[PDB]
Design a protein around this ligand. Structure first.
Ligand code: FAD
Length: 498
């Protein structure tokens, strides 16, 4: 049937969009391919933890996997599973694996909560057509407030055993002249204090994060989505995957949608039409829908920039072996609190998250997720034989990112007399993981594939709202930028078009 506005997905862009449409009085349907995560599972919990993965962990796989960095300790808990509509999807392309959330809330379900604004000078470099003053004065602060961003208590941080691993890295970086910064989060740090005291059920302190948090983490279902549902104007349909998009003869849109059950069985194929169509299926999901629509002839007026400009936010993982006298602790919070900020907009920039190790025993390992400035981009191309978008990206395109990361961590190794670990990421002796992405960005870049407010070129009433808009890099963990850009864009769209 017909609904005035449809939003595809329930991630950050989509959640912003639906809230503001509902507040404006526009009846809005959200379609989400994954589940609503609100039913206790066989252990009485909604989500599985990292030490007890089960079918809830994974989107349609037949075996659980250890989180990157932790194979040596966590492979022992892996098991065969039934393919199921689980929360974390590892999407494998030829030379890149991308990790995305699937469910009501999208990646907010599975992310580490780190809520960081990009440096203004870099924002200006990457999106020169956007007025940066309005972003920093108005839309970033709106995003932070709505997301429920909060700050750790620094006294507690200094004292607690749960953050020893971060203190050890801050000291080691300090020896090399590098500074650290506290990073705000959407996990409730007050709640975390109470976990540590044994006062409330543990989540961050019970090795939960990448398959969801049973407590503590203010994912989008608690914030934007709850507010959107509260307008009375927004409905969410789950286990509904949009496959195709076409323009009806009179300028509306019609979608073909598959309804599945949690075992992946096709129940129904539906057609939904609308006046206003907002894509929030993420960098991979929105880009695939649009490249399919262009190359199969259902949206023939899309431009040649659709599919282009993809980058993995310079994501590289590395690890250092500590001296025996510098243990990182058997108890490590799952929510990072500190980063190393060596980002000066030069080619050697790095912002590195100090990541926890989920092993629950002393490993002496310090793990980092580095964000680098690497100009290489990939392209999504449509494969008509398999009806999938394929990412044209090769491992050598990450060389600049590896070199930048290596230069930084070599400085820290030299100052402290430590070495890398080479055995954390599988078979090869490899100190730098260069074939994964947690922060996919691009494919439908703002100002190139769309206008400067995400209106897709060639079409009216067709909008993209999500990480596909960002040109491959933001220099920090990206969800606050996505959220703020969506706030900026939807405000304009609703005032001018709706
Ligand atoms: C392990 C991990 C850790 C991370 N940590 C951080 C962090 O601490 N801070 C940070 O800033 N970022 C982090 N990220 C990245 C962050 O989660 C993403 O950048 C963000 O979620 C992107 O938002 P989005 O709105 O573009 O899309 P997504 O959040 O990816 O949401 C898209 C949604 O659309 C649905 N969908 C897709 N295709 C279709 C379709 N055809 N039909 C219907 N529904 C569809 C999806 O199932 C999903 O729910 C992390 C990501 C991962 C995986």
């Amino acid at each position: 049937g017909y609904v005035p506005a449809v939003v595809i997905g329930t991630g950050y862009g989509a959640a912003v969009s639906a809230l503001r449409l509902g507040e404006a009085g526009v009846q809005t349907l959200m379609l989400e391919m994954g589940q609503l995560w609100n039913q206790p599972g066989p252990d009485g919990n909604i989500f599985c933890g990292m030490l007890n993965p089960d079918k809830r962990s994974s989107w349609f796989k037949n075996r659980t996997e250890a989180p990157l960095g932790s194979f040596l300790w966590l492979d022992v808990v892996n098991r065969n599973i039934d393919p199921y509509a689980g929360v974390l999807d590892r999407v494998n392309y030829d030379q890149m694996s991308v990790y995305v959330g699937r469910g009501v809330g999208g990646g907010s379900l599975v992310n580490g909560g780190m809520a960081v604004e990009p440096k203004r000078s870099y924002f200006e470099e990457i999106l020169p057509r956007v007025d940066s003053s309005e972003m920093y004065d108005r839309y970033f602060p709106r995003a932070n407030s709505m997301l429920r961003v909060n700050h750790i208590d620094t006294k507690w941080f200094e004292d607690t055993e749960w953050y020893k691993f971060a203190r050890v890295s801050r000291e080691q970086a300090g020896k090399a002249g590098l500074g650290t910064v506290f990073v705000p989060n959407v996990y409730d740090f007050g709640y975390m204090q109470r976990e540590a005291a044994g006062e409330v059920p543990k989540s961050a302190l019970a090795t939960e994060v990448i398959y969801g948090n049973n407590h503590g983490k203010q994912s989008l279902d608690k914030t934007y989505l709850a507010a959107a549902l509260g307008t009375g104007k927004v409905t969410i349909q789950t286990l509904h995957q949009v496959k195709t998009i076409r323009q009806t003869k009179d300028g509306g849109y019609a979608l073909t949608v598959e309804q599945k059950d949690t075992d992946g069985k096709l129940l129904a194929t539906k057609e939904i039409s609308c006046r206003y169509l907002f894509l929030g299926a993420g960098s991979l999901g929105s880009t695939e829908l649009l490249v399919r629509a262009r190359d199969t002839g259902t949206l023939p007026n899309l431009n040649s920039e659709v599919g282009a400009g993809w980058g993995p936010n310079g994501n590289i993982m590395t690890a250092r072996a500590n001296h025996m006298w510098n243990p990182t602790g058997a108890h490590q919070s799952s929510i990072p609190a500190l980063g190393i900020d060596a980002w000066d907009n030069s080619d050697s920039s790095v912002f590195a998250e100090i990541a926890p190790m989920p092993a629950g025993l002393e490993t002496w390992v310090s793990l980092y997720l580095a964000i680098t400035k690497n100009p290489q981009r990939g392209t999504f191309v449509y494969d008509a034989a398999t009806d999938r978008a394929k990412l044209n990206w090769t491992r050598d395109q990450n060389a600049p990112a590896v070199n930048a990361a290596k230069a930084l961590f070599d400085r820290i190794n030299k100052a402290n007399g430590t070495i890398y670990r080479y055995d954390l990421f599988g078979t090869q002796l490899k100190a730098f993981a260069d074939d994964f992405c947690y922060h996919p960005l691009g494919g439908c870049v703002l100002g190139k594939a769309t206008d400067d407010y995400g209106r897709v070129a060639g079409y009216k009433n067709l909008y993209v709202t999500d990480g596909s808009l960002i040109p491959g890099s933001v220099g920090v963990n990206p969800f606050v930028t996505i959220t703020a850009l969506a706030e900026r864009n939807v405000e304009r769209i609703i005032k001018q078009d709706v």
